[PDB]
Amino acid sequence: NLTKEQHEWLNGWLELWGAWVYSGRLEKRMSSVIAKFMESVEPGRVMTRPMCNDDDGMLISQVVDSVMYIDKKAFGILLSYYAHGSSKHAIASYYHRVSLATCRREVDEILNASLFMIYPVLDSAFKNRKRVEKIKHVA
Amino acid sequence: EIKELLKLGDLPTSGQIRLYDGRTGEQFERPVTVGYMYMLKLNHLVDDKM
Amino acid sequence: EEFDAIKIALASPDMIRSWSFGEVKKPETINYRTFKPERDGLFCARIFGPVKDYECLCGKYKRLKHRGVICEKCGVEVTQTKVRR
Amino acid sequence: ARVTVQDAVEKIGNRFDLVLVAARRARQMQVGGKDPLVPEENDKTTVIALREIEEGLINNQILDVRERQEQQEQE
Amino acid sequence: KPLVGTGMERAVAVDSGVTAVAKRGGVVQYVDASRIVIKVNEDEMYPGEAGIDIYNLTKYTRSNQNTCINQMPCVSLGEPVERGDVLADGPSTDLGELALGQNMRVAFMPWNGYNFEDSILVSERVVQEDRFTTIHIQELACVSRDTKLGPEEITADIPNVGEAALSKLDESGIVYIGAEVTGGDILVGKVTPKGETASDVKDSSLRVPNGVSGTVIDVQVFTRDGVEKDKRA
C-alpha cells in the first residue's frame, strides 16, 4: 500500500486540519470563570491539538472539497473521526446500529481509498505555492 | 463697511452672484449667495460611530 | 414546561430546605492560590454542582458516560454546568 | 405586494390573518418544498407567498382543505 | 487661518501654551524640522549665562483624545525674532493665530435634496486637496503578566501561525518601526506557558482592532529588573 512515513505525514496533517475545523462549531463546551482559572493555574488532561494558519487549511479544504464531492459517507466519517475523536470501532458500531465487522472493514477501506485519492493532488498543491518572503527595507 | 470692501474687491455689492449649474449646464434662475465660511470638522467621526 | 399562572406565597422553612442542596458553613469564598472553591464555603461545589462541563473536581470522571455519579473523593455530582446557576 | 400589500389586505380582510396564512405558506415552501404556483421571478418565499395570496390561488380555508386533502391521500 | 476672525486668536494660541514662544529676542542660529536654536541679543543677555536658548519640539505625540500634536517651525534661518514672538506652530495654529478648521467656498441653495435637514454637500476638490484629513494616533498596549506557570514570552516562535501573519514581525516577535499594518494582524507576538516549566501553547499576541489601519510610528518597551532583555529591547 502506501509507505508509512507518508502515512504518518497525512495523519499529522489531517489531524491538524480536523483540530482546525473543530474550533468553529457553536454547540461546544463553554467553561465558567473558576474552571478557567483552575486550568490556567494547574492543568490536567485538558490539552489541545495544533491547528493551522488557515491559508494552508484553506487550500487543503479546497482540495478535499473538490475531490470529495462524489462521496458523502467517507466525508462524514473523516469529519466525525477527525473533528470529534471517535474511534473506528465507535463509528463502525454507529453505522452498523442504524454485520458490524464488515462495516468496520468498509469504513477503513473507504478511508484508504479517499486517502489514496487525496495524497498526490495534495503534494502538487503543496509544491505549486509561492512562499511569501519576509519584510525588507529599501534604504 | 462690508459693501465698501466688496466695491474695493470688484465684486457684486450685495454678495450674491449668479451661479450656473454644473449638472445640466444651464443657469439658476435667481442669484445665489457665495462666499467663504470657516468650516470646522468635529470629533464625531463615522468610523468611530458605526 | 408549560405554565399558565405564576403563583406566589410565603416560603415555609421546610420549603426552603427542600429547595436547598446543602448547608453553607464557612465564610471563606474560595482559596487564593489554587482557585477551587472550598468545602461548605460560599461557592462550595459539593453543594452547588460542578465547575467544568461533565467533570469532577479531582478529574477522575471526565466524560458524559458517567452521566450523574458522585465523586467519592470530593462529594460532587457530575452534570452539565447549567446546574451551577 | 412587493411595495404595498394592501391588495392582499383586501383579499384576506385583516393584517394578522394575512401574516399568519402567508407564514403558513412560506413554511410549506421552505420545509415541504412545494412549488410556488406564481412564477417566482427570483424572489424570496415571503414575498412569493404574499404574491400568491395577492393573486388569489390561496386563502386560509383553501390552504386548510389542501393540507387536509394531501393528508387524507397520504393516509 | 480664519479670514474672518476676532483678534483673540493670537491670545488663545500664545497663552494656551502649546506653541514655542521665545524667551529673549535675538537671531536664529540653526532651525531644523525637529528643533530650533537661537542666539540671544547681547543687549538682552545676562553675562553670567552663555547666551543660547534651545527650543526642543515635540514631534507627533499623542493627545488625550487620540489626535495628533506636533510642532512645525515657522521661522527660517537668518531671521531675527523678539521676545514674545512665536517660533513653532502647535497642532492647530497657523503663525501664532488659532486656526481650528479650514475656510472654504460656500453656496447657500438647495441642491437636489442632498442638503436636506442640516446636511452638507462637499465637493471633490475638498477631498483631493486633502483639506480635512486629520491624523489619529492610537495607543495599543501589551503587558507580559505572570501566571504561576511561568512568565509570558514575547517571542516569534509562536505555534499555530504561519507566514500570513508573522511576516511583518522581526526575529524578536515585535513589529518593525514603520510597517503598515491592517486590522487583525499581529503587532507584538506574546505567548504564555500553558503547562509547566511545547508547553507554551496559548497564543496571546496583540491584534489591531478591526477598523484601524496605518503605520506603526513608535514602539516603546518597558521592563522589570528580574527578566533579561532581548535583541529588540
Added chain:
Amino acid sequence: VDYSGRSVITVGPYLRLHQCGLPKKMALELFKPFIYGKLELRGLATTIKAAKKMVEREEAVVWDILDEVIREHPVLLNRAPTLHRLGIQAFEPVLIEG
C-alpha cells in the same frame, strides 16, 4: 439584543419610500449566518470554519452572495427615543458603500 447595528444617518433623496441604504460592512456583519447558509447551499462552503474565513477574507463571491441574500428582506430602522408608535419602520435595504 443580537443582530443589531448602529450608524450615523444621512439623506438619500434618490431612494423610494420603502428603501434605506445599508452600508456594505454593517450588512455583511448583520447577515453573517444567512451568508453561511447561502455559501453552503451554493456548494462553496462545506464547514463552518471555511465559511467564517471566507467571510473574513471578503471575496467577490461573498459580495455576490450578500447581494442575493439582502433581496427583499427587510430591516427595522429604530431611532431612540422611540416616543410614538412610528419610531420603528421596516425598509427593504439597498446596498451602498460608505
Added chain:
Amino acid sequence: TEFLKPRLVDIEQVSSTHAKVTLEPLERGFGHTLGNALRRILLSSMPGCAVTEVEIDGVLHEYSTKEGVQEDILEILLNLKGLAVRVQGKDEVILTLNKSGIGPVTAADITHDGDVEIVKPQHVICHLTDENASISMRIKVQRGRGYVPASTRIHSEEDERPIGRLLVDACYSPVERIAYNVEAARVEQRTDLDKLVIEMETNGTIDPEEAIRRAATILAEQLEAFVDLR
C-alpha cells in the same frame, strides 16, 4: 438639414498654463451643449502624470522627521503631490533628486532623464539648513486619470511593500479650471451663429488642442453606443 461644422480657428496662449481657445462656427443653440459637455469631460477624464511612490533613504514612515531639513516629511509629500511632470514615451518612470548644501531645494534640481520634462523650475520642496545634511529621494511617476487614493491602492496592491515606499495619493487630472462662453459669431452672411470660447487652466503639462481633441474623441466614442446600437 442645413447644419455646419466647427473648427479650432484661433488658439491664443495667454501664458504657459492659462490659455483660451475659440471654436467656430457653432449652430444655433449648440453652444451651451458642446460647452457643458466638453466642460464635464475635460474636468473628469483627462490623462496626466503625477507622483505616486516616494522613496527617501533612511526614513521609515512618513510621520518621522529628518535633521537638516525644515519642512517635515508630510510637508514634503504634500509639496511633491503638487508636482507637475510631463513624460513622453514611457508610462512609468523613476526620477532622482540628490542635493546637499544650505538653501532651498527647487524642482529644477531633479536629475531628469531624456523623456521627462519638469515644467515648474521654481517648485520648492525642501529647505536644507545644514551644510552636512543630504537628501536622496527616488520618485515614481505613473500615468492615469481621475483620483485614486492611498487606501484603495493599499487594498488593491497584490505585491508586498518594503518599508520606505511611502505611498502618495494620486491627483492625476491636469485640468483644474475651465470656463466656456457663447458669444455672437462674426459671420459675414449669417447672424444666427455663435462661437465657443473655452478658457482652460491647465497644470502646464497638457497641450490644449490635444486635450480638446481627446475630449472630443471620448464624447464621440461614447455616443457610438447610441449611434450604432439603436
Added chain:
Amino acid sequence: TEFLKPRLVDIEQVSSTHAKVTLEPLERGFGHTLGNALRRILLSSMPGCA
C-alpha cells in the same frame, strides 16, 4: 486609459409612441453628459415639419 462602453439593455416599448431606453453602465458623471446633450439637441435642434 480605457473607457467603459455600455450595452443598450432595454427598450421597454410602452406604446407605439413611448419608450424607455435603460442603459448601463457609464463612467462616473457621464450619464448626465450624454443625457443633457441628447436632451438639448432633441428639444431645440431636431429637424422636422409642421
Added chain:
Amino acid sequence: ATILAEQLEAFVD
C-alpha cells in the same frame, strides 16, 4: 446622436 457625432466629426483622431 448622429447629429452630434457629425457635429463633432471635425477635430477627432
Added chain:
Amino acid sequence: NGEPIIVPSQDVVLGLYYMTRDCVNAKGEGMVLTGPKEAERLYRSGLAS
C-alpha cells in the same frame, strides 16, 4: 389623527411653492398649449419661464 405623516418638509415645500406660484408678465405669458408635455418642453427649452 387621520392626517398623513409623510408630508413634504421645507425643501420639497420650497420647490413646490416655487413651481406653483405665478408672476405677472414674466416670459411668454398668454400662450396656448396642448398640455403638460408641451409646457414642460417649453420650460426645459427655456422659451417660457
Added chain:
Amino acid sequence: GVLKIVKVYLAVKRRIQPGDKMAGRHGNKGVISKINPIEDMPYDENGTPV
C-alpha cells in the same frame, strides 16, 4: 506581577467621507451627504466651482 511592557502607537489618517460631522462657528452643524464630482458642483461664470 508583570515582567515587561511593550507599547506601540498606530497612526491612521482619517479622510472625510459621508457621515463625518461638520460645523461652522455659529451652531450650524451638519453631516456630509455626498462627495460630488467637480463637474457636478455649481460654478460661476469665471469658472470656479463652489
Added chain:
RNA sequence: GAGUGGUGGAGAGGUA
C-alpha cells in the same frame, strides 16, 4: 473531551 474576558460598580466629560 482540543483559543478566550468586559459587563459588575463608581466618577467625570460628551452626542441626539
